[PDB]
Amino acid sequence: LGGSPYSPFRIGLEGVWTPEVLKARASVIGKPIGESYKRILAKLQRIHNSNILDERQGLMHELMELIDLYEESQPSSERLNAFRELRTQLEKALYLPEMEALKKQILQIPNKGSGAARFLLRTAMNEMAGKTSESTADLIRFALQDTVISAPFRGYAGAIPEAIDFPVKYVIEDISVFDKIQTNYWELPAYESWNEGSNSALLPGLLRESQSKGMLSKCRIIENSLYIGHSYEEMFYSISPYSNQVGGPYELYPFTFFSMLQEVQGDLGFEQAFATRNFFNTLVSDRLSLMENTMLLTESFDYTPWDAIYGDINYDEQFAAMSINERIEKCMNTYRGVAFQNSSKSIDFFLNNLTTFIDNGLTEIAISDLPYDIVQQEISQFLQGSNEWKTLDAMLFNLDKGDINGAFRKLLQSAKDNNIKFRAIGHSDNSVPPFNNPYKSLYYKGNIIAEAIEKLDREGQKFVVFADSSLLNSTPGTGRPMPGLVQYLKIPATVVDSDGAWQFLPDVASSRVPIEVTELENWQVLTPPQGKILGLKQFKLTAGFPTEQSRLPLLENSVSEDLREELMQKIDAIKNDVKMNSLVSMEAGSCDSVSPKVAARLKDMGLEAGMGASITWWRREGGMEFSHQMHTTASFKFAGKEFAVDASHLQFVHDQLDTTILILPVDDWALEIAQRNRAINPFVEYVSKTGNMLALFMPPLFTKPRLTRAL
């Protein structure tokens, strides 16, 4: 997690100067505290006043950026030697010595205070703690290629006027920038009617004309600055994806607006160049949240139930006779759903036999080429028939490259006229091409599949889905396949060729692959590969020392009923076996020769040999020193669960009354040993260890409690 105060992730401050100490250290004769220094001191103050660990580390990443920016832009400052030490302090407080490679990967990302580094450390610590599945490395790969996350922020860092009554995403601080682009829109037919001599003089007219049409309503110019409430992807898909050209009916004006923005943007990222810091930061952390959600979704997905229906190698030729009407009805009645490639033909196909479709079942048509987060409301408004869907209209046009008819518009229309529920399942964020990168692809796909799994879905509804070929079947994913929308919905993927035949789309085993990764510089696997950290704290007894009565209920418990009776007899034979009691020891580290003798004597009494177990831990010594202690036990096996026979436990502090040979399940044994020994950061491997392998057995080095080195 973690806290505290033996945890390596306590994010302590003992090694980070206080503002008071900075002022003495950053002192330069003659020169007063300037604005840059002030913001740094303020931020440091918040760091020392931060009690929630996740916020503190986030803030420390924020301070690092401030120091970066100061270094970058005020490089001859005498305040620098001090600020550099401060940065190293902040680094040493978040990243442990054995976190070196993880650090380089994370702090490589521009904008340490954007929230990426915050999110990624949290992920890394949770992973190292074994408190989560492997994710950090891949999330870092996502971060590094994302067009927002990895972009040095060059957007808008100033204020938003109160007069603005919409949440702002992008700002062009100075309208004059529009007058420095290649194209001269103030010269194109037909802006001739307008009597203007620059692109910035066009701007006010462009907005007025658009907003009288119901478009660009969230754009506003105040005092030489432009404020945009429309999402980059909302503008792209509704203004030119492409296009329209001409004209007509969704006009030249918004297309001129958006083209001008794209010219101003130039070689930069749209958000990189235009975004408010606030919006940039929110985007960064949303993308990481959502990506992680998509990864968790892929984890341990079972292809059995889908393969048991549509997997059969022969299904390709079984699709089909068979007989269109005997199919379709097989999709409605039995499969409850079927997916179509997002092609005019598939729409035109599905439109044709719509009579048979609705005649049993059909309740819902869902497409992915409309973003639900932007037009969901407008679609219901279309269903109501209220023409207040200027945006939805724009996008349908662009989708159909120009309609008449159809095909997407006609599909939506036929949902209205035939009383079938229509729902968008696309998500606009990061939906803009190119899709040259598989993580950019995974993100997009995951969010669509999130909405499909969620707001489909009944349980009372028989559905048809129209989606891109890349979304339907498995794609490359994070260390494992990303299963297509079809697999998640337990339905078949289908296509329609140029001739007009409609058949199943095979999900080839070549699609079911991990992404070709390239190991990150020096990467250390974060979770320790065998065994687990029992907890990043110092373990203590809850009450008194464990007695025979205390442990009595704790074994069963377990999962099964008696059985219990068959256990106690085994236990009592072990406790009362004379040879078993002659091998019991009370010496420190006697377990080394006791366990093998235990395991041997277990075998003779016909008991089934267990893996055994070992627990190792840190114990405070002098100064800030810590030693490692360890203990091992022979064990015996039972229905699914493993039971420990520890004839050497008495070497540790004990109740004077409890038995000589300690018998519990492995996990309970581990906990009890740590507790009696007041173990600090215990590590458990479910295998007995002897001699050599037992000696050098210690917790993972990072779990070793530390200060920093300069207090």
Curated annotation (Swiss-Prot):
Keywords: Cytoplasm, Host membrane, Membrane, Secreted, Toxin, Transmembrane, Transmembrane helix, Virulence. It comes from the Bacteria. GO terms for molecular function: phospholipase activity; phospholipid binding; toxin activity. It is a single-pass membrane protein. One of its GO terms (cellular component) is cytoplasm. It is found in: Cytoplasm; Secreted; Host membrane. Signal peptide: none annotated. GO terms for biological process: symbiont-mediated killing of host cell; symbiont-mediated perturbation of host cell cycle progression; symbiont-mediated perturbation of host G protein-coupled receptor signal transduction pathway. This is a dermonecrotic toxin. This osteolytic toxin, induces bone resorption. Potent mitogen. This toxin is associated with the severe progressive form of the atrophic rhinitis, a major respiratory disease in pigs. Closely spaced cysteine and histidine residues may provide the toxin with an affinity for metal. This is Dermonecrotic toxin. The gene is toxA.
